[PDB]
Antibody, heavy 219, light 214 residues
């Protein structure tokens, strides 16, 4: 079993450098190159550079020329990639693949380098109350707006998991403020609105937050 | 600098089909091309290499061909799991590059979104901030144009949105757009509109509310 295990996710303030690692097991470390690919969120794979553990020989993509620095320890079977002057553009997932030469045979699970100067902030929950009293519509859309939080992630359940069908917890967006924010909605029967209680259970472990916000029809 | 251009960008197929993805290099790379598959929050899995050699372990329905600058990935019997995104890349010369990728999503009949507009809460307004939310529920296909309109004035740059991953039951997509304004700013107007344009709509559907009016 070949195996490349990368370091734990990193959170860094702009301007800071970072040193991600990759440990291989399952073969001859010094017989294969160790590659490094960057993949920003929702983006593709960008190659950073390559290094021969055998002697430290290294060839970098000129674009990361001033950003990436691949070093390697042949005694501890690990390769390193130190990034400098971390900025937003540096926020991505860094992978370490091994090549039985030209091909990337085995990859690492990747490391998530998140560059932001923002500090741990619990979210502010707001209701997304249903608005309408008709006979044409049967479903009513309601939900919660977990807003201005950091870092990821925020877990959201309805009526403590008693509600799952129709629920929709979208992917968090990273606001200009640098803080995260997401919305959760569930489509439910207008009739139930006055007989069933709806509550979203938002938790943000980072800030040790837990909040239940009853979302009801704004009559 | 060799460029790898895939095609299409999004392949919408149905289980069993025999899908074929293309990847064109901008320079000869002999057969130094390799295909990878990738699922959300997972590391790329090598599929083919050498332009045709099926990596040890890959299912046989996967096959790759090509040489020079024209390459094509092939799945003869698209399985319920082969639904993901596929990348091609060349390691011929430096620097190594990858294709933009091809999303192979599940096909289904068109279905317009179910739209809902949400005024900002009073609670949030107390904090001098207003977030207007527009919900486009379970629609297909994924292409959807959303436009906010305050007092019928087009907005720009004050709205963000996120799309769910193709649902696992009705294979639809849900989008959520947010128009962020300041308390005063917000109170300085009446009508807030959310115009949604989608293939499943004969004409753009709008959903609006008025500050105050219940």
């Amino acid at each position: 079993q070949v195996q490349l295990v990368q370091s734990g996710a990193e959170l860094k303030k702009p301007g800071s450098s970072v040193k991600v690692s990759c440990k291989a097991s399952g073969y001859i470390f010094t017989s294969s190159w160790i590659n490094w690919v960057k993949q920003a969120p929702g983006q593709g794979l960008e190659w950073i550079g390559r290094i021969d553990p055998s002697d430290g020989e290294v060839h970098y993509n000129q674009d990361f020329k001033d950003k990436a620095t691949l070093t390697v320890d042949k005694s501890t079977n690990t390769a390193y990639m130190e990034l400098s002057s971390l900025r937003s553009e540096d926020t991505a997932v860094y992978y370490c693949a091994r090549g039985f030469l030209p091909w990337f045979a085995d990859w690492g699970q990747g490391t998530l380098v998140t560059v932001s100067s923002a500090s741990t902030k619990g979210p502010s929950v707001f209701p997304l109350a249903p608005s309408s009293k008709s006979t044409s519509g049967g479903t009513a859309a309601l939900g919660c707006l977990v807003k201005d939080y950091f870092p990821e992630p925020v877990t959201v359940s309805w009526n403590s998991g008693a509600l799952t069908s129709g629920v929709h917890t979208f992917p968090a967006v990273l606001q200009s403020s640098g803080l995260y924010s997401l919305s959760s909605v569930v489509t439910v029967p207008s009739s139930s609105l006055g007989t069933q209680t709806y509550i979203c259970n938002v938790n943000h472990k980072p800030s040790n937050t837990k909040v239940d916000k009853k979302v009801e029809p704004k009559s | 600098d060799i460029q790898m251009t895939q095609s299409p960008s999004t392949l919408s197929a149905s289980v069993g089909d025999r899908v074929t993805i293309t990847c064109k290099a901008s320079e000869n790379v002999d057969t130094y091309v390799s295909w990878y598959q990738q699922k959300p929050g997972k590391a790329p899995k090598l599929l083919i290499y050498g332009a045709s050699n099926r990596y040890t372990g890959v299912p046989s329905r996967f096959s790759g061909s090509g040489s020079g600058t024209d390459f094509t990935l092939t799945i003869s019997s698209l399985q319920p799991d082969d639904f993901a995104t596929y990348y091609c890349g060349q390691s011929y010369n430096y620097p190594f590059t990858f294709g933009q990728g091809t999303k192979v999503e599940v096909k289904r009949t068109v279905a317009a979104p179910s739209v809902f507009i949400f005024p900002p809460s009073d609670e949030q307004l107390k904090s001098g901030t207003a977030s207007v939310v527009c919900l486009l529920n379970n629609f297909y296909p994924r292409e959807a144009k959303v436009q906010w309109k305050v007092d019928n004035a087009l907005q720009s740059g004050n709205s963000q949105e996120s799309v769910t991953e193709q649902d696992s039951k009705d294979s639809t997509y849900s989008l959520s757009s947010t128009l962020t304004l300041s308390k005063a700013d917000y109170e300085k107007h009446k009508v807030y509109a959310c115009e949604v344009t989608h293939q499943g709509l004969s004409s753009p559907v709008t959903k609006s509310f008025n500050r105050g009016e219940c």
